[PDB]
Each structure stands twice: as structure tokens, then as C-alpha cells.
């Protein structure tokens, strides 16, 4: 049709939002769909050890790495065109899996898919700001975006299990092709153009791009290696220190140089900083709780992964119910109360997991997951606050900061709280007490590796005390990390409450 339209869009632009929203939802499911499809692929091909781990690590590494420069590319190339290019590349790579030369091919496909997805999430958030220029309307527009980006993590297991039970493994991407294609069929017909002019844009900076990409990838991979190998190796130490110093170099280059790639000047405004801090610790909660509760449902209640994922619906429904009512509450109560209130309610819902539910049962888990979904829904207010006082080009820039902080929060939460949970499980199990009466040596490692491993080694060895002891230890560890997360969440809530100024309000931008 046309990729250059002024005046934004008429009153029907809301439909455009929908066309984006649901599509983004699909885009945020793929990783989950891959994870529960990991064993199946392993049966059909050669995981080759480290190759199987690279398969799941490459998409997160690339998404966290190529997220800053691609935002500038989208800004200088045409936001609508960048979004359409990303969607088309995503669809093509999803159709490319049909050729199953299971090999380095999978790694290359996942790398290309991550590169394509790096243009989706950062660009969609900026396009939402571009289409909607009204604070009251932009708040209720961003609420729907918040629901999607995350209803995706909860709904991933259900759709993945339903897809894997029928059809075959290669349908894991085949479902994503007809849904993404429709996207572009609408993405070209109801989207405006931004195309920031050459007036304030100079030539591209090679050092900025290379340094930013390498620093971000190094940081993420160092965090992952810390989680997997422990703080004893020297290579992750040197990698994290080099990544930090390179990020410092990047910040110092972007601070003073003219027309910077990522203008670090929004952090001066408190309104930006409040939302940026809020998003990280909003994602911390699910990054821990979703995985830990999935394992708990897997073990304690003895459910299949599909049903285990299905049992986690209350967390999703809590967010789906609370998010639409959030902007209305924020408009009349201000952000200073509403935004901290969501984090506080999430903290309360993760406290009720420890204080009330030491011998946890599913009723307590659901009545806690609802409150966690409330703090999930607070992301809408936080996102709004971020784009409250920001010009168009700066908003296109700031979507990248939002998405990068979001992904870093997910990685940090998963690594740190999973490591804490594993350490607590290992210390509570106390496998050294089961030596003279059974499990010794190699089997012991399995008992320390995971709760499922301990349960099945107890089943095989014929000694039954190990199963009950391991299940109790896992329950205690899960509950303890829930309490620790609650403490962190309250501490962050106090900071976010103190940060937001009094006169700030999501409506009446000026």
C-alpha cells in the first residue's frame, strides 16, 4: 500500500494496536515453545552435548546483544519498514525449519530468529508511542501491550504442550508461520511512518555499535556461566569485568558525543528512572516464581509438563484482570501510590507463600499467584511512566532501554534466584546423611542435581526415606526463596516510592 503516512491514524488506529498486540504475544512464546520441545529434538538428532545448550542460549544472547544498535537502525531506516522486515524475517526463518538437516543449521536458524526478534519488541513499544499521542489514551494503549508481553510466559507451556501432543516436533514453528504472515498483511495496511530525519542524524558509529554489542553479550553470558558453574572459574570473572568496563566505555562515548546512538539523558529525569527501576524488579518476580512453581507442580502433585503449565493459569488471569483497571487507578491516585502498590501487592503475594503455606498446597499457590499477577500488571503503569515525558525520537530510543532492562531483569532474576534455590535445596537435603544406608557417590550427585533426580533415584534404589526427605527439602527451599524475593521486592518498592515526585501524573503531559 504505502509506508509513508502523516497525521498518524484516524479513530480506527485502535485496531492497529490490536494487530500489533496479539502478534507480539506470539513472538514472545517461541522461546518457551522451544524449551519443552528440547527433548523431542534430542531424540531425532544429536544434541552433541554443548550444542544442545547453545541451542537454548543463542536466542537469549543475541536478543540481549543486538537490541541497542537495531533500535537506531529502525529509527534511521523507517519504523514501519523495520517492523515489517522483522516480521517477514521471523516468518521466513520459521518456515525454514521445514528442512530438517538437524545440525549447525538449528544454531544458525535460532541466531537469525533472534536477530529478527531483536527488531520486534523494541520497535513495537516505540510504534505504540508514535501512533498514540494523548496521555489518557496512551495509558490504556500501553496496558494492552503490557498484558501481551507477559501473558505470553504463562501461556507458553499450555500451547506448547497442546502442539507437541499432536502433530510433530517440526510444527513447533509451523504454527507460527500463518499467524505471523497475517501480521504483515495488516502491518502494512494500518501503520504510520516516523522516519526520523537526517537533520539530527549523523553517520553511523562503528565503535559504539561494536562496543555495545560485545559488552551486552559478555554481561549476559557471564551471568549465565556464573549460574551454571559457580563463582570459582576465572574465565567468567574476566568476561564480566571486561564487559562492565566496555559498557562504561560505551556510556562515556554516548554521554558527550554528538547525536549519540542511545542518548543517556532520560535518566536525568526522575520519571524515566522510576519506571526503568520498576521494570527490572517486576520481571524478577516471574523469572523466579514461574520456573520454581512449574518444578513444584511437576514434583509434588505428580503432573505432566503440559498439565503442570496448565495449573499455573491463576497467575496469568490475575494480571489479565488487574492490568486494564491499572491506568484508571493511576490517573486519579497518581503514580506515586499506584506504581509502588503493585510491587507491594506482589511482595504480599510472595510473602503469603512462606508465612501461611510452609506445607504448601495448591490453594495457597493459586491465591498467591493472583497477587503476583497484580504486580505483573503494575508493569503497565511503569511502562507508561517511562514514556510520559519523552519526545518522539527520544521515545523510539527509550523503547530499547525498556526492553534491554526487561531482558536483563529476567536473566538476573532467573540466575540469582535459581542459584539460591539450588543451594538451599542442597543444604537442606543433606545427602551426606544417606551414605552408610544407601546412596553413595555418583547416585548422590543425581540426588543433589534436582528434586526429580532425587525422587527417581529413591524409587530405583528401593530406599524410600530419600523421596520424602527430598520433597520436603525442595518445598522448604522454594518457600525460602519466595520469602527472600518478597524482602527484595519490598525494599525495591520503598525506593520506587521515594523516587517518583509528587506533582507527577500520567495525564496532562504539559
Amino acid at each position: 500500500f504505502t509506508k509513508t503516512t502523516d497525521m498518524m491514524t484516524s479513530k480506527k488506529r485502535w485496531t492497529a494496536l490490536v494487530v500489533l498486540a496479539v502478534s507480539l504475544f506470539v513472538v514472545t512464546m517461541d522461546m518457551t515453545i522451544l524449551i519443552m520441545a528440547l527433548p523431542e529434538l534430542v531424540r531425532e538428532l544429536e544434541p552433541s552435548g554443548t550444542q544442545q545448550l547453545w541451542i537454548v542460549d543463542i536466542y537469549s544472547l543475541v536478543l540481549a546483544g543486538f537490541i541497542i544498535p537495531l533500535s537506531a537502525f529502525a529509527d534511521k531506516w523507517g519504523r514501519k519498514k523495520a517492523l515489517l522486515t522483522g516480521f517477514a524475517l521471523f516468518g521466513l526463518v520459521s518456515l525454514a525449519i521445514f528442512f530438517a538437516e538437524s545440525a549447525e543449521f538449528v544454531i544458525a536458524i535460532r541466531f537469525l530468529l533472534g536477530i529478527a526478534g531483536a527488531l520486534i519488541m523494541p520497535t513495537t513499544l516505540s510504534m505504540i508511542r508514535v501512533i498514540f499521542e494523548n496521555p489518557k489514551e496512551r495509558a490504556t494503549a500501553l496496558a494492552v501491550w503490557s498484558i501481551a508481553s507477559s501473558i505470553g510466559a504463562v501461556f507458553g507451556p499450555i500451547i506448547g504442550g497442546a502442539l507437541l501432543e499432536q502433530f510433530s516436533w517440526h510444527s513447533a514453528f509451523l504454527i507460527n508461520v500463518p499467524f505471523a504472515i497475517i501480521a504483515v498483511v495488516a502491518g502494512l495496511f494500518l501503520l504510520p511512518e516516523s522516519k526520523l530525519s537526517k537533520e539530527k542524524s549523523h553517520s553511523w558509529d562503528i565503535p559504539s555499535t561494536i562496543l555495545s554489542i560485545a559488552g551486552m553479550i559478555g554481561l549476559v553470558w557471564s551471568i549465565k556461566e556464573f549460574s551454571k558453574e559457580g563463582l570459582a572459574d576465572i574465565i567468567p570473572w574476566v568476561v564480566i569485568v571486561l564487559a562492565i568496563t566496555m559498557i562504561v566505555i560505551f556510556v562515556k562515548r554516548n554521554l558527550s558525543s554528538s547525536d549519540p546512538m542511545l542518548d543517556v539523558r532520560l535518566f536525568k529525569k526522575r520519571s524515566f528512572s522510576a519506571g526503568t527501576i520498576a521494570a527490572f524488579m517486576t520481571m524478577f518476580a516471574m523469572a523466579s516464581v514461574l520456573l520454581l512453581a512449574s518444578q513444584w507442580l511437576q514434583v509434588v502433585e505428580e503432573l505432566s509438563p503440559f498439565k503442570a503449565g496448565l495449573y499455573l493459569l491463576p497467575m496469568a488471569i490475575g494480571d489479565m484482570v488487574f492490568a486494564p483497571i491499572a491506568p484508571g487507578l493511576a490517573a486519579r491516585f497518581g503514580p506515586k501510590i499506584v506504581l509502588p502498590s503493585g510491587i507491594g501487592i506482589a511482595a504480599i503475594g510472595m510473602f503469603i507463600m512462606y508465612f501461611f503455606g510452609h506445607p504448601l498446597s495448591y490453594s495457597t499457590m493459586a491465591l498467591a499467584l493472583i497477587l503476583v499477577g497484580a504486580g505483573m500488571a503494575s508493569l503497565a503503569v511503569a511502562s507508561a511512566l517511562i514514556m510520559l515525558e519523552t519526545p518522539t525520537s527520544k521515545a523510539g530510543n527509550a523503547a530499547a532501554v525498556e526492553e534491554s532492562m526487561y531482558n536483563l531483569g529476567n536473566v538476573f532474576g532467573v540466575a540469582v534466584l535459581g542459584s539460591l534455590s539450588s543451594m538451599l535445596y542442597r543444604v537442606f537435603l543433606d545427602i551426606s546423611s544417606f551414605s552408610s544406608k544407601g546412596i553413595v557417590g555418583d547416585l548422590a550427585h543425581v540426588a543433589e542435581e534436582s528434586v526429580v533426580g532425587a525422587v527417581e533415584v529413591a524409587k530405583a534404589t528401593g530406599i524410600k526415606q530419600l523421596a520424602n526427605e527430598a520433597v520436603t527439602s525442595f518445598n522448604d527451599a522454594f518457600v525460602a526463596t519466595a520469602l527472600v524475593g518478597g524482602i527484595i521486592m519490598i525494599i525495591i518498592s520503598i525506593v520506587v516510592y521515594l523516587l517518583i515526585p509528587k506533582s507527577l501524573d500520567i495525564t496532562k503531559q504539559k
Epitope: 547416585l443 543425581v446 533426580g453 527417581e456 524409587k459 530405583a460 528401593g462
Partner: nanobody, 115 residues
């Protein structure tokens, strides 16, 4: 219903079991002097497989599985002429390896003795 194998007498034997899945089940070896099929070793179908040995044969025996013919390859040293027994190989058990219990399958075993 399935297949079995045998081995030589010193050195060591090797079983086999056509068919089967052993994705969780217990699959192992048994022996008996002219009384009970006490048992020597077994494998439980977990990640890379969980191996369980007997108290009297620990370290002296080696048991492994091949995911190409469902073989029960075995090896050992210290072939003392006291475990000369009616060796047998079984599989498809719900749990509690190395114990004469619920088994949906049993083979012909092998005829081995040491003088």
C-alpha cells in the same frame, strides 16, 4: 516374546533383549547358586541411566547399555570361583532394582561355571 543372550570359563558375559523400551523401567542381571536369584547389577532408565550394584560385587563388575540393539553388555574382573551361578537377565520392572519383585519379563539366562 523378546530375545536374550549368553556368554562364556572366565572373562565375562553379555546379554541382550530384543524389543523393550526401558524409558523408566528397571533392567538388570540376576544370579543364583543351585536358592534365590540374589542379583548383581541393574540399570534404571534415567538421564544417561542410573546404575546400581550389589554389595558383594561392587567395583568388580561393569555394566552398560547400547542404544542400538538394547544390549546388556557386561564385563568384570576378580572371577573368583564362588559366584558360579545360574546367571539370568531381566527387564521391564516398575522399580526397586536388584530385588526379586514385580517383573513383566524374564529370559533364559546362561549356563556359566568356574572350576
Amino acid at each position: 516374546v523378546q530375545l536374550q543372550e549368553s556368554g562364556g570359563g572366565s572373562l565375562r558375559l553379555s546379554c541382550a533383549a530384543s524389543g523393550y523400551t526401558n524409558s523408566r523401567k528397571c533392567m538388570g542381571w540376576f544370579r543364583q547358586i543351585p536358592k534365590e536369584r540374589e542379583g548383581v547389577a541393574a540399570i534404571y532408565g534415567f538421564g544417561r541411566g542410573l546404575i546400581l550394584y550389589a554389595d558383594s560385587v561392587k567395583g568388580r563388575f561393569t555394566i552398560s547399555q547400547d542404544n542400538a540393539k538394547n544390549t546388556v553388555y557386561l564385563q568384570m574382573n576378580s572371577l573368583k570361583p564362588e559366584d558360579t551361578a545360574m546367571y539370568y537377565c531381566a527387564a521391564d520392572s516398575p522399580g526397586s532394582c536388584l530385588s526379586r519383585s514385580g517383573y513383566n519379563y524374564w529370559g533364559q539366562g546362561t549356563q556359566v561355571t568356574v572350576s
